[PDB]
Design a binder for this molecule. Structure first.
Ligand SMILES: [Mg+2]
Lengths: 113, 111, 110
């Protein structure tokens, strides 16, 4: 499969959305639809799926939620996984410093009941 | 392929958007790009593609628009398809009760 | 793989977003995530990936950024590539004719 560039993913302070390459998406749409489809489209290209999941982990998302791709990633290159873990800890620290600061529905209700 | 969770899809009253796992998308973008890519990414994993298409059907969308995947799905387990049909009829009733009750700034951006 | 319909893609005047089947997306999200995933999902079905990349090219986007799919496409049917090129030039002429973004900071800090 062809690889993705390093995934530009930021998780929102309330965790409800992500910012992916300048596009804001609901977190659950990204993790349940987008990432699953990216991984499935890699087929058996474990190097590519490992890259994707390292970026998922680095962004603070759950890289273990993707079946065989997750099991491959979890028993994959320890040093690249560790670089992802360093990035993840930096992300969590950013979330902590962001947690140091002090009507969508109605709209959706009118459109979807 | 790895499976999707049960697809959380709601069709808007005017049918122009869908709400998928909390994300609003144009219906045409979802059905022409997103669903097509999900199904293609299953390869020949018919259990997964039948799951996807049962959720598409249950949401009130057209599960017949996806070539070989739709042909497989149409011949698939009748009871699982019927459970999807029950959900589809409930969604249609919800649309009926809702039918009982801009800006197109796109021009400036896209011409 | 199953085919896509002709891709309805318009590039914004500032090039920062695209309008794809009525959905506005950041251009980089569309080209880095969506298109890459569509192409990967075709596997080795070059007829389908060539159709995708002709529509990408026709919209004013870079059809050369997708590895093997781009390499296959660049040597594919010259007349179909040229029809895409005509659409691309018409799109560029369209771009030529003329007359609190964060906001994300409060949400993402960056
Ligand atoms: Mg998408």
């Amino acid at each position: 499969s062809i690889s993705y560039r390093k995934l530009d993913i930021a998780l929102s302070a309330d965790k409800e959305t992500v910012l992916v390459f300048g596009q804001e998406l609901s977190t659950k749409y990204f993790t349940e639809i987008v990432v699953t489809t990216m991984l499935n489209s890699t087929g058996s290209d474990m190097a590519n799926s490992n890259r994707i999941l390292n970026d998922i982990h680095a962004a603070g998302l759950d890289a273990g939620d993707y079946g065989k791709y997750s099991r491959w990633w979890a028993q994959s290159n320890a040093q690249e996984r560790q670089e992802a873990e360093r990035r993840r800890k930096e992300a969590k620290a950013h979330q902590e410093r962001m947690a140091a600061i002090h009507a969508r529905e109605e709209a959706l209700i009118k459109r979807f009941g």
